[PDB]
């Protein structure tokens, strides 16, 4: 037994619905259920035997289907509610979808932008590393420009995001650019740049090291 | 309920492995032990499951071979064992109490790789409200874990998935305290690395 979720990853309002699929491969006879998944927490249970809400989860999460064909709601997101979610065939065996990854919508936010130096212990290598923060901003989406002596360094950086915040909506980036020791200190300024919707001029962080 | 899952892992390609899943809090024979995969990035997968007492086994097809269900009634601990091991068996896995609260294990994160354990370098990065670092930097495998002052400090964390790059990982994570706080009393990450079992702590000066 195959199981088909549908989407693959969400993005949706704050107050707002959603809707998940699932289709199995043959009649599993409403034997499925649905879990949330948040990271380095609980898979939880949420729903079993199609419609049954397990104890405490509210009203606006509810679940549909028989045959093959499913469906998960929940309305009236809150930020809480960000997770992957998961259904669960139980009805031979078991098997999970694919997951549905869902994010929830909220008011732009511009990031807080932080640049680092390299360490002194990092010095001690032939390498140093020049760090930037960009905390808690929405809408994912973000350039982070390097520049060195006004200058734009495309390689030898390192981007990830957090996963979205579960209390406040945002996201948080964290870049970081390496270079040798000695092509460190070839150079002065160092920018850490940041392109997002809320500011139509980069959040712009620097610090001069012969200075 | 105890369901206390063994150590992270790293093998070579071909070889085998046995994850221990370590029940302790409740009659081991009243429910069957789970074995799930985790992704990266999404996706969990049902191996199979055993039963402690009856002994009945039940597999996933395409796990059927790769994995080996066992499980020790005298010392309450369900196992899987792993069989030639690719890189497509790199992931985190799971064991779970069957559910008829609902009980998992922690995870254990098996690495397939020819690599061998480097322990990360932790930098101390230092400049209203003041953010600090630390930047993990070049080891292998996953995982390491970061915390600020013990777990004192935590709400103005943000820690950074790990990125692989040229064949070791290298996260940093942040926090935000007030700038009334540091310098005068003291910010010191503490990152554990377990497959090299270290636990190193760096006060940002
Ligand atoms: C979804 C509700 C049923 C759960 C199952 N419980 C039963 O099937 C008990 C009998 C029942 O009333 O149908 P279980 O937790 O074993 O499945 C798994 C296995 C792996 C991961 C997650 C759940
Ligand atoms: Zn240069
Ligand atoms: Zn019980
Ligand atoms: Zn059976």
């Known amino acids: 037994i195959e199981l088909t979720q549908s989407p693959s990853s969400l993005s949706a309002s704050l107050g707002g619905k959603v809707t998940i699929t699932c289709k199995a491969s043959?009649?599993?006879?409403?034997?499925i259920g649905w879990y949330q998944h948040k990271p380095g927490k609980q898979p939880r249970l949420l729903i079993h035997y199609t419609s049954t809400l397990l104890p405490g989860i509210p009203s606006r999460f509810r679940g549909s289907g028989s045959g093959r064909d499913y469906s998960f709601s929940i309305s009236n997101l809150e930020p809480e509610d960000i997770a992957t979610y998961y259904c669960?065939?139980?009805?031979?065996?078991?098997?999970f979808g694919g997951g549905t990854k869902l994010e929830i919508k909220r008011a732009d936010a511009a990031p807080t932008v932080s640049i680092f130096p390299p360490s002194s212990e990092q010095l001690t290598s032939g390498g140093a590393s020049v760090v930037c923060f960009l905390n808690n901003f929405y809408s994912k989406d973000i350039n982070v420009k390097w520049k060195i002596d006004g200058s734009e360094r495309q390689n030898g950086v390192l981007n990830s995001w957090t996963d979205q915040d579960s209390k406040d909506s945002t996201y948080s980036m964290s870049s970081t650019l390496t270079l040798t020791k000695d092509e460190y200190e070839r150079h002065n300024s160092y920018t850490c740049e940041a392109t997002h919707k809320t500011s139509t001029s980069p959040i712009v962080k620097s610090f001069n090291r012969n200075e | 309920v105890q369901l206390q899952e063994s150590d992270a892992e790293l093998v070579k390609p071909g070889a085998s492995v046995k994850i221990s899943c370590k029940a302790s809090?409740?009659?081991?024979?009243?429910?069957?032990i789970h074995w799930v995969k985790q992704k990266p990035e999404q996706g969990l997968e049902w191996i199979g499951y055993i039963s402690p007492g009856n002994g009945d086994i039940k597999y996933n097809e395409k796990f059927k071979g790769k994995a080996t269900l066992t499980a020790d009634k005298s010392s309450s601990t369900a196992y899987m064992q792993l069989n030639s091991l690719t890189s497509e068996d790199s992931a985190v896995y799971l064991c779970?109490?069957?559910?008829?609260?609902?009980?998992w294990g922690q995870g254990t994160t098996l690495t397939v790789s020819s690599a061998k354990t480097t322990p990360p370098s932790v930098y101390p990065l230092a400049p209203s409200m003041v953010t600090l670092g630390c930047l993990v930097k070049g080891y292998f495998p996953e995982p390491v874990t970061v915390t600020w002052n013990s777990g004192s400090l935590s709400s103005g964390v943000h820690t950074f998935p790990a990125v692989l790059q040229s064949d070791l990982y290298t996260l940093s994570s942040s926090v935000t305290v007030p700038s009334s706080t540091w310098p005068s009393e003291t910010v010191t990450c503490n990152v554990a690395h377990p497959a090299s079992s270290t636990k190193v702590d760096k006060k940002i000066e």
């Open positions: 779970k109490r069957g559910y008829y609260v609902d009980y």
């Open positions: 043959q009649d599993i006879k409403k034997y």
């Open positions: 669960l065939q139980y009805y031979n065996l078991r098997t």
């Open positions: 809090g409740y009659t081991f024979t009243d429910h069957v």
